[PDB]
Amino acid sequence: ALRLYFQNGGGPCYLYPLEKADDNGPLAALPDLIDEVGEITLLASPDPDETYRTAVYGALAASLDQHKGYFLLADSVNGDAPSAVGGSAQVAVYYPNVEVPPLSLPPSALIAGVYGKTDGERGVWKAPANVVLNGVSDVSVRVTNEQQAELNPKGINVIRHFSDRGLVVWGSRTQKDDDDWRYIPVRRLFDAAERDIKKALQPMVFEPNSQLTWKRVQTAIDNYLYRLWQQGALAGNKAEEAYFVRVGKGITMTQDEINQGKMIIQVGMAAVRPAEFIILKFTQDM
Amino acid sequence: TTTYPGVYLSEDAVSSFSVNSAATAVPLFAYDSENTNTINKPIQVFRNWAEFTVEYPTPLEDAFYTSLSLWFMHGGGKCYLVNEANIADAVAQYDDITLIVAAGTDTTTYTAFTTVVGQGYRIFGLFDGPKEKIAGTAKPDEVMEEYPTSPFGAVFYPWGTLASGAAVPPSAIAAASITQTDRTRGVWKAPANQAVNGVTPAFAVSDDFQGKYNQGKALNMIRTFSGQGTVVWGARTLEDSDNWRYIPVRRLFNAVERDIQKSLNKLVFEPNSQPTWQRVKAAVDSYLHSLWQQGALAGNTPADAWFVQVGKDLTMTQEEINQGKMIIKIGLAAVRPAEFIILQFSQDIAQ
Amino acid sequence: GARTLEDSDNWRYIPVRRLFNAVERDIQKSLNKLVFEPNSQPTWQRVKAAVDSYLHSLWQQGALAGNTPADAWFVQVGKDLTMTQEEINQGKMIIKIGLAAVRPAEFIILQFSQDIAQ
Amino acid sequence: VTSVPGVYIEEDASPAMSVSASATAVPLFVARFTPLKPELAGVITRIGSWLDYTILFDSNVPSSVVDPTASV
Amino acid sequence: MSTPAVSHRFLVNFLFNNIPNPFDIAFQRISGLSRTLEVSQHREGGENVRNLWLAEQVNHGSLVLERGVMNASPLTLQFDRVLRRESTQWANVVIMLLNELSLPVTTWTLSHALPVRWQMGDLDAGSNQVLINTLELRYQDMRMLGVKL
Amino acid sequence: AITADDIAVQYPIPTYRFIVTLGDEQVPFTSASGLDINFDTIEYRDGTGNWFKMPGQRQAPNITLSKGVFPGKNAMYEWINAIQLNQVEKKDIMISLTNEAGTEVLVSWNVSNAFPTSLTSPSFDATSNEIAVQQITLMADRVTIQTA
Amino acid sequence: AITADDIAVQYPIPTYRFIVTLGDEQVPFTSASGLDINFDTIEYRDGTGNWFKMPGQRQAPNITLSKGVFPGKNAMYEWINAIQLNQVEKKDIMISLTNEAGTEVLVSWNVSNAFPTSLTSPSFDATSNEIAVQQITLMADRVTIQTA
Amino acid sequence: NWFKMPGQRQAPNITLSKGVFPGKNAMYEWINAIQLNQVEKKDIMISLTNEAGTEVLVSWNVSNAFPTSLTSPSFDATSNEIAVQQITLMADRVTIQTA
Amino acid sequence: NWFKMPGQRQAPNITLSKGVFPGKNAMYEWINAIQLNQVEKKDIMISLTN
């Protein structure tokens, strides 16, 4: 599963060797070891056993709603979510097991590869859903349109086979059915922007909590959000329609909140949504 | 079994056929569920005649063997033997099928043909006529009631009497004149007057007989003439409408609508914006201009042969952009064939 | 006969063993003039372009099986590809070279049919 | 009814119509227009294109010797 | 429509009966194979407006070959024997074009080709050119094969 | 008082903002030139003085695209390296004059079946403060303009 | 905030820093030009309107390298002096855009079998404050680019 | 019809000047770290401040600045002046935030 | 196979320019003495000097 990861776009690739499933000792100590390392973004446990992943997905479900920026790549078993992570916006399920010359692998090791390929070539605001999977030959189940039509209004994200292209990842939805966090590239744009703003403002911690510092923090966010807009990440036409940064004492704070040593910043963005339906509507009248 | 490095002299040599395939003719040959000499594998893929005889080595005399052996001896590329029960799922899974060929099959391919047409899979069915002699006092309404009233099908009555004594289903005669036409003339030209070799029509058919069976549901005779031996004689579909008569103009749009979506599936999950809509309509104008200049489209200028249209007040609204939709409308004119030739004669003696 | 003393998929056929003996000796005669150069990234680029220049001439005279240069050979050298930094410090320079050879024909089967007066 | 993220095909569409932009000729056609949803029965509605007419108003309106001519 | 065939890649195979191995030799300038049918016009008495062409005898052309003066091949040693009249052996020649991959798209397949003429290039003191020698064969029959006929 | 929504309809379009879609991808270029539509001409004169002038048949365009040399891979090189004697992946090129933000195409030129015939290296010069610029020349069969 | 390790990946490469490995040695040059990849073109038209366009076969490159005249030996001269009527030590040239310190090759051009066809002397001029510069023109058979 | 339009904005050239102090020269250490392309770009903020120095009245922000020159002071034995270095910067955008 | 070879070298054309001085014109009495095939052929050294 790691050789198919580096064939599809490699990375620094942290590993956690976990031998058997039912040892609840190392699985309870797992979310505390992830926070000690600074730079994990994806989870994506690549194991063919079904009860092995359920013990992993249940141990990692409490760390996904803690604003830490992780993103789980779960795997369906027979066409549904694995129910440890039901409807959180941090989870992308991928259904068909993928066969290698024939052992069948869960597709999370390959999809974690094609995220790094897509983000390096197109950015995190691009939907990672037209990448042809290198390595592998054929999926275990050839999925029709009619069963994807009952799966794609959930986040199931079927690996499809096209005869001219090969194996194409086909679907870019999360588990959240909200209009805001429906798509993967909208969700991972906000997770990546919050991660890079956080790395930029940590030099401004333990500064004097004055109005001079609040403008140094506002400009450091405004310089970051401007160079996302001018490379196509944000959906705007004026750069006042793309984003805003607000900080002040009458605005976003009260004097009792400065005295307890905190500054409060309101940042907003506007992302663009992908085109996933194309209707052709032919005729021969003119 | 090769042991020494020399030359081996084997004398159990059999026939062989070179593949001369067309990309727009990948058929599905349906074999019967209650057939004894087929492999229990329900869906099986045959790229050539050599892969077909390593799984069916002895020459059988059944409907599926004489359909496929008549397929591969007229070119023919990859094709599918699918059981009658799995015809609606083999089209939905294998992405490549353009033809549903009922190789001696009734009432189960018909109800699974009308399933995948309502699901919209851009296929064309080739059905069979009666294996018995149609009388002449039989009526074209009571004989043509087994068949769907969809424009994606044709019927082809007269069965074959292959030179080894076997009987060829007349869908296989029709599918072997589609391979030879989709190379030499294209998918927009009629599969009719191309002659198929090695077969013979079982019954002699008159043209007074075909006149009853032409309008309405279109039986589509298989007739032999002196010179052009055993052509298929007729190119009409199972509905008699101004649009979707004539097997050429249905199979032309099936090839257009499949080559456009193979080109536009590489633009899915792009951002639904005005720069992407311009890239769609220039990928269709570039496909249809090449198709116009090789004779597929009727028009003496590009404005009379096709149009592509996409906008924000033209084809789709802003409340419909927000659902991820991208409506393109494409109209294009096809070339209708000639079907009737009237020779008006005058003479006068010594003048 | 042209077979060697083992019957394996790689090292059957006296041609494809003696081809690699000639490849591996003409490459080391070319790379012995690069020994005691500084073990740095400019030297690794000079190694892999001296092998690509040898194998491209060998491809275009029929020695290598492939209808494109990407199917006939590859040369690979890096710092996370073929060798590690703890292995640079020992003076080592690992190059990996894969190349496809042309296997001969060994058996010819003449399949005969006839029929009298037909 | 679009649920599969592929490409859909329809075959009996009508050709769309283009609209221009002008500020000196904005008319008010008073005719026998038949609405679909009946809240816009006695008020004035803006119809920015022909696509806006087909959604708000009934554009077919089958005849009965009288013939509907407001959509034509 | 499929792309037409260009004319700068070609193999030539020779098979003599003196020589036990079939050999393959690279040339520069294969000339071109003609095949004429040699009709004759007849004039009838009462007919003044149409013509009448009567088929007689198929005439084949000649295979003219050009290559540089290089090391002695089994074919320039064989023209040396025939033009010294030490042998009168002739060969079956196979000429074939190659497409982008390696594949033979057309094949010409001459029969009983006889070496009849050697022609040496010019020796000139200011020339800047390879010494090209011209070879020429007369064959009996010709049979073109391939998919691009 | 001109209210720049009227500038987007009435004023002309400048040359410095453009995107080049080359096949299935966009590649950032610096220059782009040669997208002409050129015809031949046929004439005829007779002795009475009639002189007929006709358009001939149009000749093929030669497009020229230049961009800089970047530390990644050379995507213009792997399309001219893969010439096997007749064969080339022929691509269809769109060169679109775009607005500032990049979110609206103003007018575009469509090159239909282009294939590379030349690629020039940068000119190495030890006394120059310049960027390594390659240019590729392409040969096509038609150039169209869509105005939307 | 751009942190110049990102400049080494994203920004383009300038022309003034390059090294030229010529055979088994490196020679310091001032200019280097002519490392093109050029193809011919084959066409075909028939009476129905089909017009086929094909790449031809590529022609040979002419490289140009210029350096100054130094008080030692003239290493470009003893490679063009040793022409015996057909024969020349053919060398393989690498022209590599390098980083400042010289310890990393960014992108390089590989000339395969080069041999000299011309060598020009400096232009002696008693009113000029210039350096004696020779230039040598080379003829090869292929030019490749390796991007590492 | 004359059509007048704004073109594309060109790069700003910002010049700063400070005195020479006996410690470590921070502006020499940023112009000495040039390796043929590679410079640490910095964000410049020049804010008009109150007299205490703790709150911004109006600020001029500068996006990606890198040094292009650094002048030495003019040494003169007959002058009572302070040694002033003058660095010039080149960037891509100038932003004015007012608060 | 495509073989590339050096040809044979062509003859040089040297160009020397100097000023007109009040003495005798030493470049003139070497080009004046051309008799139809014949010329005193000389060997020239052009030396970069300190």
Tab-separated table of C-alpha atoms in Angstrom, chain E residues 33-136:
chain	number	residue	atom	x	y	z
E	33	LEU	CA	9.268	0.115	-58.953
E	34	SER	CA	7.194	0.531	-62.109
E	35	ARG	CA	4.862	-1.972	-63.745
E	36	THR	CA	3.483	-1.255	-67.239
E	37	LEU	CA	0.964	-3.405	-69.122
E	38	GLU	CA	1.878	-2.421	-72.742
E	39	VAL	CA	-1.388	-1.947	-74.606
E	40	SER	CA	-1.595	-1.316	-78.357
E	41	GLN	CA	-4.065	0.773	-80.317
E	42	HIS	CA	-6.117	-0.824	-83.090
E	43	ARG	CA	-7.984	1.185	-85.713
E	44	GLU	CA	-11.246	-0.233	-87.030
E	45	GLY	CA	-12.704	0.576	-90.443
E	46	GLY	CA	-16.019	2.187	-89.774
E	47	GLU	CA	-15.306	3.549	-86.301
E	48	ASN	CA	-13.748	7.000	-86.102
E	49	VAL	CA	-14.731	8.336	-82.671
E	50	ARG	CA	-13.741	5.715	-80.048
E	51	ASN	CA	-10.416	3.994	-79.396
E	52	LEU	CA	-9.530	0.339	-78.922
E	53	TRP	CA	-6.711	-0.668	-76.574
E	54	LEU	CA	-5.602	-4.299	-76.514
E	55	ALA	CA	-3.694	-5.718	-73.545
E	56	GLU	CA	-0.474	-7.570	-74.247
E	57	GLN	CA	2.433	-8.037	-71.839
E	58	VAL	CA	3.323	-6.806	-68.360
E	59	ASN	CA	6.690	-4.999	-68.236
E	60	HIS	CA	8.473	-4.585	-64.911
E	61	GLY	CA	10.946	-1.827	-64.189
E	62	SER	CA	14.340	-2.004	-62.514
E	63	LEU	CA	15.602	-1.782	-58.935
E	64	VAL	CA	18.217	0.973	-58.722
E	65	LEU	CA	19.932	1.208	-55.331
E	66	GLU	CA	22.372	3.736	-53.856
E	67	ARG	CA	24.614	3.523	-50.809
E	68	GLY	CA	27.964	4.875	-49.732
E	69	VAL	CA	31.319	3.185	-50.125
E	70	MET	CA	31.478	1.338	-46.802
E	71	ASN	CA	32.955	-1.986	-45.679
E	72	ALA	CA	32.512	-5.012	-47.938
E	73	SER	CA	29.024	-6.446	-47.432
E	74	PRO	CA	27.720	-9.800	-48.733
E	75	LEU	CA	26.032	-7.876	-51.588
E	76	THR	CA	28.954	-5.889	-52.974
E	77	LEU	CA	31.000	-9.086	-52.840
E	78	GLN	CA	28.153	-10.713	-54.791
E	79	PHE	CA	27.953	-8.044	-57.502
E	80	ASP	CA	31.710	-8.459	-57.854
E	81	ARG	CA	31.243	-12.156	-58.620
E	82	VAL	CA	28.395	-11.641	-61.091
E	83	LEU	CA	30.071	-8.764	-62.933
E	84	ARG	CA	33.277	-10.820	-63.142
E	85	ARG	CA	31.015	-13.585	-64.546
E	86	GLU	CA	31.979	-16.082	-61.833
E	87	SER	CA	28.343	-16.655	-60.875
E	88	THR	CA	24.912	-15.849	-62.261
E	89	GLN	CA	23.041	-16.280	-59.010
E	90	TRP	CA	20.046	-14.079	-58.392
E	91	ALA	CA	18.121	-13.307	-55.253
E	92	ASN	CA	14.696	-12.899	-53.760
E	93	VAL	CA	14.531	-9.332	-52.440
E	94	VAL	CA	12.082	-8.084	-49.789
E	95	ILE	CA	11.705	-4.307	-49.419
E	96	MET	CA	9.470	-2.870	-46.719
E	97	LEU	CA	8.543	0.507	-45.226
E	98	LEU	CA	8.289	0.986	-41.476
E	99	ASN	CA	5.835	3.078	-39.463
E	100	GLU	CA	6.490	4.951	-36.202
E	101	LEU	CA	6.685	1.847	-34.032
E	102	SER	CA	8.469	-0.781	-36.079
E	103	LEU	CA	5.705	-2.260	-38.143
E	104	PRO	CA	5.862	-3.076	-41.872
E	105	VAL	CA	3.092	-1.122	-43.580
E	106	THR	CA	3.924	-2.092	-47.183
E	107	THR	CA	6.152	-4.767	-48.710
E	108	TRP	CA	7.297	-5.170	-52.317
E	109	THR	CA	8.915	-8.628	-52.547
E	110	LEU	CA	10.908	-8.963	-55.790
E	111	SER	CA	11.789	-12.332	-57.350
E	112	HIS	CA	14.950	-13.550	-59.121
E	113	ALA	CA	16.739	-10.200	-59.102
E	114	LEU	CA	19.953	-10.221	-61.144
E	115	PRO	CA	22.827	-7.740	-60.564
E	116	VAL	CA	23.418	-5.983	-63.870
E	117	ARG	CA	25.180	-2.638	-63.272
E	118	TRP	CA	27.691	-1.038	-60.906
E	119	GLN	CA	28.258	2.717	-61.123
E	120	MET	CA	30.855	4.560	-59.045
E	121	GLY	CA	30.611	8.178	-57.947
E	122	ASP	CA	32.946	10.962	-58.973
E	123	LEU	CA	36.373	11.561	-57.464
E	124	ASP	CA	36.812	15.336	-57.254
E	125	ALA	CA	39.456	17.282	-55.355
E	126	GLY	CA	37.093	19.953	-54.122
E	127	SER	CA	33.922	18.012	-53.492
E	128	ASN	CA	32.839	17.600	-49.808
E	129	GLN	CA	30.762	14.472	-50.376
E	130	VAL	CA	30.524	10.758	-49.593
E	131	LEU	CA	31.513	8.427	-52.432
E	132	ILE	CA	28.158	6.911	-53.464
E	133	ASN	CA	28.011	3.819	-55.653
E	134	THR	CA	24.928	2.923	-57.689
E	135	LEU	CA	23.655	-0.653	-57.930
E	136	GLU	CA	21.027	-1.932	-60.332
